[PDB]
């Protein structure tokens, strides 16, 4: 049985994105837009009022399997967007003029193991010759800069750049689906946890975006609405230097892609439970999340 306010395990999140979206067919449809690597169905939701070529935002959580509140923030999104659809004006709006592109999972296998066998498991679940050691960061795997910094070129390690980039059956379908739709979309939004940040370009390197003074900008005013229901304190910046050099990540390879709005979230907490956010701070830590989500949306708006 699934629920907003505790974790789900994989099955019952497969069934949700089916059942969510049989019951608002009005502004969900739901694809697969490639399998991983032990062949989980990758589903997509797109949420929105359908009509002709409608911009659209791009949101994917669970990257990382460890992540659990990224997972829960993409499912909390889809409700959101679907009850108060009508009813609050802003979300009104929002899905009458653009589409939201929810990816509720990429890493679907290494999720699984978190529930099975390792819950503090980060990378893919796919093979390396030559080792028993398994995975691929998902977020070292893509073609910004790749395995130049922040990288790992051992399989071993938790940030194993992949044997190429876009190795991974997974980051692959996520890129081949955001290089066949890069004219409608405009925002890329990558959910992880945790720290409590907005990051922007550039992790691959220590040059900052040309539109540095505006993502800054942007940034600063999304976490001060955040931090307007419980006083939860962000910070933001460029990711090279607000977190450590890394190369490889889908927020940098985004952007350079031509989305000119592209962040990496990092949500609930600062590290007193981390990873192991309690399932009794879910909803305050989606609710305030969705408010800089909305900010960043609206502003969005604003170059269509
Ligand atoms: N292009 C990017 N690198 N963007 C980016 C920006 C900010 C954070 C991140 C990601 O960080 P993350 O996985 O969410 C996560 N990082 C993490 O688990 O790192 C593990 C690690 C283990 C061994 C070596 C190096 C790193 C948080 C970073 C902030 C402190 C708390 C943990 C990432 O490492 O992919 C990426
Ligand atoms: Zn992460």
Same mark, same amino acid.
């Given at each position: 049985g699934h629920s907003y306010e505790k974790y789900n395990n994989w099955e019952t999140i497969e069934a949700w994105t089916k059942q969510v979206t049989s019951e608002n067919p009005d502004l969900i449809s739901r694809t697969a837009i490639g399998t991983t690597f032990l062949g989980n169905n990758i589903y997509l939701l797109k949420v929105g009022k359908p009509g002709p070529n409608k911009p659209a935002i791009f949101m994917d959580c669970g990257f990382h399997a460890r992540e659990w509140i990224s997972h @829960?923030?993409?499912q909390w999104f889809v409700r959101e967007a679907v009850l &108060?659809? %009508?009813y609050e004006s802003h979300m009104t709006e929002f899905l009458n003029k653009l589409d939201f592109?929810? *990816?509720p999972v990429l890493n679907i296998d290494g999720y699984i193991y978190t529930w099975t066998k390792n819950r503090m498991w980060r990378k893919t679940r796919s093979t390396n010759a030559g080792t028993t050691c398994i %995975? &691929?960061?998902?977020?070292?795997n893509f073609d910004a800069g790749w395995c130049t910094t922040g990288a790992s070129t051992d399989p071993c390690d938790e940030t194993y750049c992949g044997s190429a980039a876009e190795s991974e059956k997974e980051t692959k379908a996520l890129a081949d689906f955001i290089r066949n739709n890069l004219s409608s979309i405009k925002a890329y939004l &990558?959910?992880?946890?945790?720290?409590?940040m907005i990051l922007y370009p550039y992790s691959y390197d220590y040059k900052l975006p040309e539109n540095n003074a505006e993502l800054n900008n *942007? @940034?600063? @005013? @999304?976490?001060?609405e955040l931090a307007t229901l419980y006083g939860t304190k962000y910070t933001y910046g460029p990711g090279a230097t607000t977190i450590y050099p890394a190369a490889g990540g889908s927020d940098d390879w985004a952007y350079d892609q031509g989305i000119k709005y592209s962040f990496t979230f990092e949500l609930r907490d600062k590290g007193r439970y981390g990873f192991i956010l309690p399932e009794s701070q879910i909803q305050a830590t989606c609710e305030e999340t969705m408010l800089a989500i909305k900010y960043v949306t609206n502003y969005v708006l604003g170059h269509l």
């Open positions: @829960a923030f993409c &108060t659809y %009508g592109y929810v *990816l %995975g &691929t960061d998902p977020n070292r &990558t959910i992880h946890s945790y720290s409590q *942007l @940034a600063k @005013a @999304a976490v001060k």
